[PDB]
Amino acid sequence: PEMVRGQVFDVGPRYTNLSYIGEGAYGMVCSAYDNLNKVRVAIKKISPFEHQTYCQRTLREIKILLRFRHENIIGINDIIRAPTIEQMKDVYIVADLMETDLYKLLKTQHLSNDHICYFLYQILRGLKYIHSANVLHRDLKPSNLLLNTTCDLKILDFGLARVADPLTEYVATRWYRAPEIMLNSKGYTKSIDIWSVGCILAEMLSNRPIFPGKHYLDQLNHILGILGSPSQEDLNCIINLKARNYLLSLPHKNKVPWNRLFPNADSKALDLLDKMLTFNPHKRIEVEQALAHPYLEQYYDPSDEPIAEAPFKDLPKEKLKELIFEETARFQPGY
Ligand SMILES: Cc1ccc(NC(=O)c2cccc(C(F)(F)F)c2)cc1-c1ccc2nc(NC3CC3)ncc2c1
């Protein structure tokens, strides 16, 4: 009965008063009220079952969210789906509503060094847990960082974005992607997530994304314009030879030091930024090393930076539906 921008949300009576937040390739997110627990929530409706890849992404989302519990990662409240597998065509994942996000905050505010520092700390604390579980986030960016009024930050994965027709918040954007993704089909690592954080830190230090551009080649040109042309050593770390020939073909660009781009930035912040935005993924700083960096010394406390107790280590969509039915069973009434 409640319908929001053409999507029915079969979610009452417990949850009511829906309001649109955004949509993606196969689902939609609204705010809503929880009457059982008397709290504002967010609810992600997804309809993945006709397509194999959406089913894979959905199973992965569910398994991760069941296992994960961390103060800097969005947490699951409930999963609503039909009592019968044949009847189940939509799944709704419920989590607590956060007031705002970094993407919105960056539009209205130049952030102080103190705020940058605390936000970066929480990003890294949350990411330490994700990475300790041997999970890759793969799409860190400001729209995927929730905030509230007291500067608490929570990592999100909003999910696969809507077709972009060749400016708004939930589009797929490439600005935070590591160069090895641009340059290679997947041999991807934790390191890509650290590059993304580097890009987010650079953006906090300024008023704009550091590596924009319409195509990969425009971005790579911006990247090379700041980092300088790759050393021979860096060229050798590029595994796809077609891509390595191409960088090899470009004019030499000199390195622009970070303190020339951000003349007013904290020098410790810039030292950490440099270590995150390193072209060679093997030399890129790892999440635990980043937490221990002098920039974060006000907050660093490994005894209070949890690791996951339960690390992770082909299928037809119909089979993936079964698996999804099983994983959601715990939230059914009769359990
Ligand atoms: C409702 C909901 C359900 C599921 C998810 N899923 C995840 O965040 C997710 C999925 C896969 C992996 C991971 C992660 F990060 F690796 F742990 C997270 C997010 C949400 C979600 C989406 C948007 C939200 N927006 C807000 N606030 C609006 C920005 C103002 N608050 C809570 C939200 C919560």
Q: How far is CA 93 from the centre of its chain?
A: 17
Q: How far is the CA of 252 from the centre of ligand 1 (A)?
A: 42
Across the chain, the runs of DSSP E, i.e. the strands, are: 3-4, 7-8, 15-24, 27-34, 39-46, 76-80, 91-96, 100-101, 145-147, 153-155
Cα–Cα–Cα angle for 212, 213, 218, rounded to 5 degrees: 120
> For the chain, how far is it from start to end, CA to CA, in angstroms?
27
What was the elucidation method? X-ray
Residue from 34, 65, 74, 125 whose mutation best tests the ligand 1 pocket (most atoms within 8 A of CB): 74
* Ligand-binding site membership of 25 (annotated): yes
In single-letter form, the type of residue at position 246 comes to Y
Q: Looking at the annotation, which residues are catalytic?
A: 139
CB 29 within 8 A of CB 45: yes
Tokens of 192: 């890509």
Give helix then strand counts, H and E, for the chain.
12, 10
Distance between CA atoms of 239 and 44, rounded to whole angstroms?
A: 38
Distance between CA atoms of 203 and 316, rounded to whole angstroms?
A: 41
Of residues 72, 75, 82, 129, the one with CA closest to residue 102: 72
Question: What resolution does the deposited structure have, in angstroms?
Answer: 1.9
Q: Is 73 helix (H, G, I), strand (E, B) or coil?
A: strand
Backbone φ, ψ for residue 307 (5° rounding): -110, 155
- Domains, the chain, with CATH or none: 1-97+316-335 (3.30.200.20), 98-315 (1.10.510.10)
* Ligand-binding site membership of 176 (annotated): no
Residue with tokens 């906090």: 204
Distances (CA, A) of 103 to 120, 153, 173, 204: 14, 12, 13, 10
* Strands 15-24 and 145-147, bridge-based pairing: unpaired
Cross-strand partners of 32: 41
Residue with tokens 């969005």: 74
Q: Which atom of ligand 1 is nearest to the CA of 135?
A: 16
Distance between CA atoms of 111 and 97, rounded to whole angstroms?
A: 23
Question: Quick one: 295 exposed, middle or buried, by C-beta within 10 A (0-12, 13-18, 19+)?
Answer: buried
Tokens of 284: 């890129």
Q: Which atom of ligand 1 is nearest to the CA of 74?
A: 8
Residue from 11, 132, 149, 156 whose mutation best tests the ligand 1 pocket (most atoms within 8 A of CB): 156
DSSP sequence for 1-29: --EETTEE---TTTEEEEEEEEEETTEEE
DSSP state of 227: H
Distance between CA atoms of 168 and 335, rounded to whole angstroms?
A: 41
Taken in order 274, 275, 280, 283, the sign of the CA dihedral is positive
Backbone φ, ψ for residue 181 (5° rounding): -80, -45
* Ligand-binding site membership of 318 (annotated): no
CB 38 within 8 A of CB 12: no
Q: How far is the CA of 97 from the centre of ligand 1 (A)?
A: 9
Q: After which residues is the chain broken (C to N over 2.5 A)?
A: 166, 313
CB 111 within 8 A of CB 68: no
| CB of 130 sitting under 6 A from ligand 1 | yes
Note if the bond before 13 is cis, omega within 30 degrees. Answer: yes
Which residue lies with its CA nearest to atom 2 of ligand 1?
44
Q: Which atom of ligand 1 is nearest to the CA of 43?
A: 1
Distance between CA atoms of 297 and 116, rounded to whole angstroms?
A: 13
Query: At a CB cut-off of 8 Å and minimum separation 6, what does 292 contact?
Result: 300, 302
Query: At a CB cut-off of 8 Å and minimum separation 6, what does 223 contact?
Result: 179, 211, 279
Residue with tokens 């972009």: 164
| CB of 147 sitting under 6 A from ligand 1 | no
Cross-strand partners of 33: 16, 40
Tokens of 86: 């044949």
